[PDB]
Structures are given as structure tokens and as C-alpha cells.
Amino acid sequence: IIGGTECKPHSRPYMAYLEIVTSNGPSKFCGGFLIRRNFVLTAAHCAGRSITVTLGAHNITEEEDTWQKLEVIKQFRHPKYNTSTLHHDIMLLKLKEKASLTLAVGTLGRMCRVAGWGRTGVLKPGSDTLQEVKLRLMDPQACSHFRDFDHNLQLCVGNPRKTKSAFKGDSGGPLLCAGAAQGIVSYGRSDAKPPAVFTRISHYQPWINQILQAN
Template structure:
């Protein structure tokens, strides 16, 4: 049986370790998910003009708005948009049991911003395939959050190896970064995308304890391809209602 203590010691929010600043004119699909005080609590990414994907456990921070179109959260030239509805995967219970995905419906955008394409219903990631993860926040254990978006390359980890390192690993996840490396995510990146070949294939979910120096535990992402039917159903139903 999976030890719930193991997962309760995992981080509930994450940021980029040993990455670099994202180019100014890139990643305009990235969203800062914020609370009513205007504090960044999680990441997310825009998939249509009115839907942002994030992690289900980010709902614990009571998000009220998303900020789009700005790499530097200190700048004012961004869109702050109210969250209209939060759609959490119905069988999500806690971060350690998987299904860590949430779809945020936002009030329709007033100007054009970039969206990111999702993978088809089935994808095949190669072991050691290089992908990217991006976000705002801490760059070292117990460090301070950053205001400028950062990005880092991470390699896909074989699922069998990942299961050996995470006994009781939940289903429908992707493992990449944080294992035999100094690169990955840490506090503040939850809900952000894992990007492979230009597609948002994963959602940042959890890593091991509050250690961003990286012990031998892979970083865990929710596999978006396993939730395409659920996402498409919500998006289409909202459009039908309009």
C-alpha cells in the first residue's frame, strides 16, 4: 500500500531549479494563478481563449485570478482576468493519488494572447527525450521567489525506473527531471506545463519533500493525454451554452 506519509512530505507548490530566464517574446501561454491578494500561488497555461489548465491541488490556495501576457510579474502590462469557474477532475482526492488536474474557465480575454496546443489522446515520449518546464518562484531550497519567468530543460524518465523510485506511483503521470540531475521544478511551479515538441504534455504535480537540491526522486507531472476527453468535453459544453 502506498504510504500517504511519503506523499504528504512532497511539495505542494513548485519552481524552476538551475534554469534560465525565458526569452521575452516566448511562452505567452503561461499563466500566473493568483489569490485575491494578488499573490502568485501556482502556474498554469492557456489552451483556448477562455480556459487555463492548472493542477487540482492549486485549488487549496483559493485562486481568484490569472495573469497572462507578462514574463515579469512586477510589470503592469499584463492581463489580470477573473476566474469564472473551476473544474476539478471529479475523482481527484489528494496529490498522492493522481488526477491532479484542474481546468479554469476565465472571463473572455480582451486581447489576443498565445495558446499552447495539447497532445492527442495517445502520446509516446522517449526515455531521455529533452522537454522543458517553466514557472515563477524559488530557485533553491527555502529561497525566494522570482518575478521573471524561468525555463529549464528536463529529460523524460523511464516509467519503470520512476515506479522503483516512487513506490505506489499514481496512474496517468509522466516523470521528467529531478532524478540524477540538478534540474527540475521546486516551490511555486505547480500547474505549469511540461513541454515536449511544442506540446503541453504534462502538468507540474509534485516532487520529493522540500529539497530542491534533488535527491534521487523524479519530478512528477499529470499526463494530459489521459484527460483529453475530459478537457474537450468541458470546453465544448461551455461553447454550446454560449
């Protein structure tokens, strides 16, 4: 998160920190959010050979009693997900058991908010602490330069006149508008110039329901 503020610890109790394993590279990291006690919603580009979720985290470097580290048994990447265009950049992770409900862990033109542990600048490392930023929802024309952006599938997020932005490491995290999840962090420019592209959750709600009911 570029240009944001440190979250009040545990104030976003649905946030999930994902550590993703690849067979031929070191670990990668993404965000996500708990939508049922045994399901996390994230971006399809955060798929890997295996994933661990950490719920209850603020400072991700320091283990505390709020932490619940949970195994993912199965990854449900959207069947139409496209690795080039990042169309249908959405994925459900089924956890091995249901999370415990605690104060720190629970399920979940206008201004919206996004949180994550991603980098705080192009050249900066990932944040130790959960950060949050308020971003403007833009008209789709603002995202035209992303040649494969589609207004029906995706939100266009972040006033280009501000530096404020989600960035590397924030992928998979939710965008909340009036407290309801409306987007998933998907992609943007390497130079962090807003706006960025988010998955439009509303479009995928039938598919979300289909996975949950079968699992």
C-alpha cells in the same frame, strides 16, 4: 525552477500566473497555460476559494501593457482528484471573458521543457521572472519511490543526476515536448531531488474536451 534560465520575455505567450485565495491563509501561487481564449489548464492542487490569472507576464512584479489580469468565474477540478495521492491532478479554469490575442498572449527518454515563476532553490524565494529548464523524461521505474505514482496517469520527469527541476510555485505549469504540452507540474520531493511527477495530459484529453464542450 531550479537550474534553469530566464525566458526571453514573452517567448511563452500561453503561460499563466495564478494567484489563489484561501479563506484561512494568505495567497498562494501556481502556473498554468492558456488552452482556449477563456480557459486555463493547471493542477487541481492549485484550487482555492478564488483565482486570478495574469497573462502576458515576464517580470511578475512590474505591471506592463502586455498584462491581462482576468477573473476566473469557475474552477473545474477533475472529479476523481485525490488530495492525498494527487491522482488526477488537473483542473480547468474558465475566465470571465476571452483574452485578447497579442504577441505576448496566445493559446497553446526525450528532453522536454518546463517554465514557471517558482522558487529557484529549496531555500530561495519565487522568481520575479519567468524561468525555463530542459528536463529528461524518465522510465517510470525512476519514480517508484513515489509509492502512488502510476505510469498510465503520470510522467516521471528529471534526471536524478542533475539538480535541474521544477519546484514550489511551478505547480500547474506545462511540460512541453517538441513544442506540444505533454505534462502538468504536479509534485516532487521537498529536497528538490529529481525526478518529479507530472500529470500525463493525454490520459485526460477526453475529460478536457467534455468540460470545454459544456462550457
